[PDB]
Design a protein around this motif. Structure first.
Motif, PDB file in Angstrom:
ATOM      1  N   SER A   1       0.903  -1.238   0.054  1.00 32.45           N
ATOM      2  CA  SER A   1      -0.011   0.099   0.091  1.00 32.45           C
ATOM      3  C   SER A   1       0.953   0.969   0.040  1.00 32.45           C
ATOM      4  CB  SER A   1      -1.120  -0.097   1.096  1.00 32.45           C
ATOM      5  OG  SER A   1      -0.330  -0.688   2.287  1.00 32.45           O
ATOM      6  N   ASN A   2       0.669   2.286   0.742  1.00 30.18           N
ATOM      7  CA  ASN A   2       0.907   3.557   0.580  1.00 30.18           C
ATOM      8  C   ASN A   2       1.149   4.218  -0.996  1.00 30.18           C
ATOM      9  OD1 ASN A   2       2.010   6.077   1.760  1.00 30.18           O
ATOM     10  ND2 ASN A   2       4.280   5.653   1.601  1.00 30.18           N
ATOM     11  N   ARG A   3      -0.020   3.670  -1.824  1.00 31.58           N
ATOM     12  CA  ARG A   3      -0.183   3.905  -3.141  1.00 31.58           C
ATOM     13  C   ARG A   3      -0.359   5.234  -3.617  1.00 31.58           C
ATOM     14  NH1 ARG A   3      -4.397   0.134  -5.145  1.00 31.58           N
ATOM     15  NH2 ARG A   3      -4.094   1.051  -7.151  1.00 31.58           N
ATOM     16  N   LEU A   4      -0.742   5.979  -2.476  1.00 33.84           N
ATOM     17  CA  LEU A   4      -1.153   7.576  -2.514  1.00 33.84           C
ATOM     18  C   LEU A   4      -0.291   8.459  -1.651  1.00 33.84           C
ATOM     19  CD1 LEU A   4      -4.983   7.496  -2.975  1.00 33.84           C
ATOM     20  CD2 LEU A   4      -3.304   7.518  -4.678  1.00 33.84           C
ATOM     21  N   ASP A   5       1.031   7.830  -1.280  1.00 38.33           N
ATOM     22  CA  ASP A   5       1.911   8.503  -0.442  1.00 38.33           C
ATOM     23  C   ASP A   5       2.100  10.098  -0.882  1.00 38.33           C
ATOM     24  OD1 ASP A   5       4.171   8.759   1.251  1.00 38.33           O
ATOM     25  OD2 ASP A   5       5.584   8.600  -0.219  1.00 38.33           O
ATOM     26  N   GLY A   6       1.745  11.029   0.087  1.00 34.89           N
ATOM     27  CA  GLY A   6       1.799  12.430  -0.016  1.00 34.89           C
ATOM     28  C   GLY A   6       0.913  13.046  -0.679  1.00 34.89           C
ATOM     29  N   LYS A   7      -0.149  12.275  -1.161  1.00 34.52           N
ATOM     30  CA  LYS A   7      -1.450  13.238  -2.026  1.00 34.52           C
ATOM     31  C   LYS A   7      -2.127  13.747  -1.157  1.00 34.52           C
ATOM     32  CE  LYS A   7      -0.086  11.180  -5.959  1.00 34.52           C
ATOM     33  NZ  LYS A   7       0.706  12.028  -7.151  1.00 34.52           N
ATOM     34  N   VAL A   8      -2.597  14.869  -1.706  1.00 38.07           N
ATOM     35  CA  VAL A   8      -3.647  15.745  -0.789  1.00 38.07           C
ATOM     36  C   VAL A   8      -4.906  15.715  -1.882  1.00 38.07           C
ATOM     37  CG1 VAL A   8      -4.211  17.917   0.117  1.00 38.07           C
ATOM     38  CG2 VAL A   8      -1.926  17.053   0.469  1.00 38.07           C
ATOM     39  N   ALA A   9      -5.899  14.990  -1.366  1.00 37.24           N
ATOM     40  CA  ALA A   9      -7.240  15.138  -2.322  1.00 37.24           C
ATOM     41  C   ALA A   9      -8.322  15.448  -1.501  1.00 37.24           C
ATOM     42  CB  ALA A   9      -7.565  13.396  -2.090  1.00 37.24           C
ATOM     43  N   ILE A  10      -9.191  16.447  -2.413  1.00 34.50           N
ATOM     44  CA  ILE A  10     -10.606  16.826  -2.246  1.00 34.50           C
ATOM     45  C   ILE A  10     -11.361  15.821  -2.755  1.00 34.50           C
ATOM     46  CG2 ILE A  10     -12.181  18.532  -2.761  1.00 34.50           C
ATOM     47  CD1 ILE A  10      -9.814  20.804  -2.659  1.00 34.50           C
ATOM     48  N   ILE A  11     -12.573  15.248  -2.031  1.00 32.71           N
ATOM     49  CA  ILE A  11     -13.580  14.397  -2.645  1.00 32.71           C
ATOM     50  C   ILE A  11     -14.980  15.113  -2.186  1.00 32.71           C
ATOM     51  CG2 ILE A  11     -14.499  12.115  -2.587  1.00 32.71           C
ATOM     52  CD1 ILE A  11     -11.789  11.379  -1.244  1.00 32.71           C
ATOM     53  N   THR A  12     -15.544  15.555  -3.439  1.00 32.17           N
ATOM     54  CA  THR A  12     -16.831  16.396  -3.073  1.00 32.17           C
ATOM     55  C   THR A  12     -18.017  15.299  -2.823  1.00 32.17           C
ATOM     56  OG1 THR A  12     -17.488  16.403  -5.540  1.00 32.17           O
ATOM     57  CG2 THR A  12     -16.345  18.280  -4.653  1.00 32.17           C
ATOM     58  N   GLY A  13     -19.045  15.435  -2.204  1.00 30.46           N
ATOM     59  CA  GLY A  13     -20.028  14.560  -1.912  1.00 30.46           C
ATOM     60  C   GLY A  13     -19.163  13.187  -1.125  1.00 30.46           C
ATOM     61  N   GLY A  14     -18.314  13.464  -0.173  1.00 29.26           N
ATOM     62  CA  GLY A  14     -17.481  12.653   0.315  1.00 29.26           C
ATOM     63  C   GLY A  14     -17.999  11.983   1.630  1.00 29.26           C
TER      64      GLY A  14
END
Ligand SMILES: [Mg+2]
Ligand SMILES: [Mg+2]
Ligand SMILES: [Mg+2]
Ligand SMILES: [Mg+2]
Ligand SMILES: [Mg+2]
Ligand SMILES: [Mg+2]
Ligand SMILES: [Mg+2]
Ligand SMILES: [Mg+2]
Ligand SMILES: [Mg+2]
Ligand SMILES: [Mg+2]
Ligand SMILES: [Mg+2]
Ligand SMILES: [Mg+2]
Ligand SMILES: [Mg+2]
Ligand SMILES: [Mg+2]
Lengths: 251, 251, 251, 251
Positions: A1-14
Motif C-alpha cells: 500500500s502507501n499507493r497515494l503517498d504524499g497526495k492531498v485529495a478533495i472528494i466532493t460528496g465524500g
C-alpha cells in the motif's frame, strides 16, 4: 500500500456512499483528504469514522457554489498543503424523461452535475498545474455518460457533458506539460444506503437485462478505480473513461 | 426525390451556412421549412433565396429563449400545419480551454448549445408525438461530442451533453411508441463563410493530422445526412450518431 | 432520385434479404449492380426480379474465396465498366458462446466474415483508386461490432474486426487521395425470411430490453443507408459507423 | 500490497517489455506466474530476473499453437495449482496498409493476435469457471482497437476483434455466474527495447499530434492497470476497455 503517498485529495460528496468509500481507501493508501457535503453533522461524523484530522477533515460545500470552491481549495491547502487530487463525485438525479423535465429540474441538476464539475476542474487545473504533484482530476461521469435511460434525461445530459469536457481538460493539461491528468469514472449501479431507500430498485438494477452479473456493485468497487487514477501508477492515463458496471454497457 | 414529401421542418440557425444548406435540400425534397436566426434582414433574404412562402419562411428566434420556442412551434403550425421535423442546428463556440473559460462564457454557450437543444427536443416530443407524422428530431452534436479539443472546453461539454441527452429522448420516444425518432449529426470541419472569416483556419483544419482527407467539407455534406434522418428512409434509426468528418475521428 | 447515377456496384450476398434490398434500391437509383451468392438458381432469379442484365447481373461466389474475388471484379468490369462501389454484405453466424465455439466454427465464420471482407476491401482499393469514380466501400459490421452477445462469440470477433479494419482502410485511402471512402453499416435486428425460419426469434428480438422500438426492422432500412454511403452525397464521410438498430445500442 | 494474494497467472509474451513488467508487478503483489515466449534462453533468464521458481516459471509457447495452450494450462496447474488469471499479451505487428497486406501476412498476424487470444480465452473460461478463484482474463486490445492507423491494417482488424470478442465472453461468464471476468487493456505507445530498435519511432510516437503528453509510456504503465484487473479490487469490472495512452484517443 502507501499507493497515494504524499497526495492531498478533495472528494466532493465524500460524506456518504461512494464518496465516503473513496475517502476511506484514499486515507488507507496514505492520502490526506478533505471531504465535502451539505450537512455538517453527517460530514464531521464521516471524517471521524475514517481517521484523525491529520488524515481527513470535512468542509461544508454545495458543489454548485462557485465562490465556495475557492474557499474549499484554500481550506484544504491550510490543513494539508497543496492539493494534488480532486474527485468530482457530488451529484444529483431527477427521475424524469427529457419530455417531462421541468426547466427548474434541468437547471438544478446541471448546476450540481455539470457547473460544479466545471468549477472544480477549472480551479483544480489552476491550483495543481506546474507544482510537480503528479496531479489527478477524477470526474464522476456514469454509465449514463455512455448510454441513455429514458427516465434520466437531465442526468444523461450532465454525464455526457462531463465525459467529453474532461477530455478537453486532459488534452490542454497534457499539451501544456501541466503535470495534471483528467479522467472519468463510470459506475454502473452500486448499492448505496440511498438505493436501499428505494424499494425494488436493487432488484430492478440486478435483472440480467440491466446488470449481466445479476447483482449491483458496492462503494469500494468505485473506491479502488479512483485509487488507481489518483496514484502515480496511472501517470500515462489521461483523457480516458474507466467503467466499473457489472457488464451493463457491454450488451 | 420528394424524399421529405409532406414533412414540416423547423431548422434553428437556418439562415446561414450549414443550417441554410439543410433548409435548401429540405425544400428541394418537398418539405415545408421554418428557418430561425437572430437577424430578420438575413433570415428573410435567406428564406427568399430558397423558395416562396408556401415552401419556406423565417422566424426570428434565439434558441436559448424558452418562451420563444413555444411561439416558433405555433408560427410553424399556422404557416404549414403540424411540425414533423426539428433540426437543432443553432450553436456558438468559445475559443477557450476549460482552464481559461469564464463563468459568463460557460453559461452563454450552454444556454444556446445545451439549454436550447433541450427546450427544442422537449417541446418537439410534446408537439410531434402520437400524430402519425414519422417525426424526427435531428440534434447537431459535433465531432467535439466524441473527442476533446484543448481550446473548446465549453463547446465539448455542450456537444457531449447533446450526444447522450438525445439517446435518452430516443429511448423514451421508442418505448412509448410516440412515432418520434431522435438522432445526432456530428460534422467535422466544414467551409462556412465564418471559417472564411478566420484567416488560416481552413488550412489548419485541412492538415492530415486533423482531417485525413486533406480538406474540409461543405454545407451540403451536412444537408444530405439530415435529409436521410428527416425522411421515412431512416424509420428504424433512433438513438444513434451520424458522423460526417473527413476521417477526423477515425484516427 | 438518380442518386447513384453512373455507379457500378458489387454487393456480396445480394441474392436474398438485406443484400437483395440494397441491390433493388441501388438499381432504382441508377447504379449497375453485380450481386453475388452461393446458389445460381437463387441468384439468377434474384437479378431478374430487380431488372434487366443491362442493370443487374449475378456472379456465383463464396466471399471467403480469394481467387474468386479477382474473377468477380473482372466479370463486373466486363459487364458494366470500372467498379465504383463495393458492399461487403455476405456473412454467416454461429450461435455459440466463445466458450462453446469449436475451432472449425471459428475458422469457418472468420473465413467469410473477416477474410472475405478483407479480400474485397483490399482488391476494391486497388481496382477503384485514382479513377475519379467517387468510389465507396461499404462493409457490413453489425450492432455486434459495438456490443457483445454471449451467444455470438465468433460473430462479435468478426464484426469488431470489420469495424476497425475499415477505419484503417478509410485513413490510408484519404491520406493518399485515392478517391475511395470506407465506412461501416451496423444493422440491428432485421426481418429476413431467415429470421422467419427461427420460431420465436422475431419476438425475442422485439422485446423492449433488446429493441426499444418494440419491433425489428426491414431490409429496406439497410438499403437506404447504403444508398447514402454509395452516393456522392456522402463524399465527406469516411472511417465512420452508421447504425440502424431501432435503439438497440442506445441503452 | 499483496493485491494478488493467492492468484495464479499465465502471461503470454511475458519474457520481454510489457509482458515482463506485468509479470514483475504480479509477483511483487503475491501472484504465482507462468510467463510464455518463443525462446527458452530469453524466457528462463526473464523468470530468474523476477523471482524463484516457487514465484515464477517459464513455458515455451507460440500463442497461435492451440494444442500448446492445453499443455501451458496443465504445466501452470502442476507448478502452482489452479489458474485464476490469464493475460493474453503476446502479439505481432505488420507495418502494412490493408491495401498492401499479403494474405500470408494477414493469416500470420491473425493466428497470433486473434486466434491465440481466442484459444486462451476459450480455454481459460473452461479451466477457471465455477472454482471460486475470482478469475480474470485480461486481453491486450490496443489503442488500435479504437482508431485506425493507415499502416496497421491487419493489426487494427485483430485488435477490433479482441475488443468485442472479449465483451461476448464477459457477458456469457457474468450471465452464467462463472466467477470469470473478461476485460481489455488498450496501451498507447510504450517504450519497449523493440521501439528502441526502430530509429525515429519514439520521436514520431511523441509528437503532440500523436501522444498529447509529448512522450510515450513505459512497461510499468501497463503492468499497473493489469494488477488492478487481476485483483479482486476489480470484481465489478467486466466487458470493459481500460485505456492507458497518454491522451492518444482523447483527440
Ligand atoms: Mg452531507
Ligand atoms: Mg452548504
Ligand atoms: Mg446496451
Ligand atoms: Mg440570422
Ligand atoms: Mg432574437
Ligand atoms: Mg446552465
Ligand atoms: Mg460510436
Ligand atoms: Mg483521434
Ligand atoms: Mg444464393
Ligand atoms: Mg460458390
Ligand atoms: Mg522469448
Ligand atoms: Mg515455440
Ligand atoms: Mg483466420
Ligand atoms: Mg469507450
Amino acid at each position: 500500500s502507501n499507493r497515494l503517498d504524499g497526495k492531498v485529495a478533495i472528494i466532493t460528496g465524500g460524506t456518504l456512499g461512494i464518496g465516503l468509500a473513496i475517502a476511506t481507501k484514499f486515507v488507507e493508501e496514505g492520502a490526506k483528504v478533505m471531504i465535502t457535503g451539505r450537512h455538517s453533522d453527517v460530514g464531521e461524523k464521516a471524517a471521524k469514522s475514517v481517521g484523525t484530522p491529520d488524515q481527513i477533515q470535512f468542509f461544508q460545500h454545495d458543489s454548485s457554489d462557485e465562490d465556495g470552491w475557492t474557499k474549499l481549495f484554500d481550506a484544504t491547502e491550510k490543513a494539508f498543503g497543496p492539493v494534488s487530487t480532486l474527485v468530482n463525485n457530488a451529484g444529483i438525479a431527477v427521475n424524469k424523461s427529457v419530455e417531462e423535465t421541468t426547466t427548474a429540474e434541468w437547471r438544478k441538476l446541471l448546476a450540481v452535475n455539470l457547473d460544479g464539475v466545471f468549477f472544480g476542474t477549472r480551479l483544480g487545473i489552476k491550483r495543481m498545474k506546474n507544482k510537480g504533484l503528479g496531479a489527478s482530476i477524477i470526474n464522476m461521469s456514469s454509465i449514463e455518460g455512455f448510454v441513455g435511460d429514458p427516465s434520466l434525461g437531465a442526468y444523461n445530459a450532465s454525464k455526457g457533458a462531463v465525459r467529453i469536457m474532461s477530455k478537453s481538460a486532459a488534452l490542454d493539461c497534457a499539451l501544456k506539460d501541466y503535470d495534471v491528468r483528467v479522467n472519468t469514472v463510470h459506475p454502473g449501479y452500486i448499492k448505496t444506503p440511498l438505493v436501499d431507500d428505494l424499494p425494488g430498485a436493487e432488484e430492478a438494477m440486478s435483472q440480467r437485462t440491466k446488470t449481466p452479473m445479476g447483482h449491483i456493485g458496492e462503494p469500494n468497487d468505485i473506491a479502488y478505480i479512483c485509487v488507481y487514477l489518483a496514484s502515480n501508477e496511472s501517470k500515462f492515463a489521461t483523457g480516458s473513461e474507466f467503467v466499473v458496471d457489472g457488464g451493463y454497457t457491454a450488451q
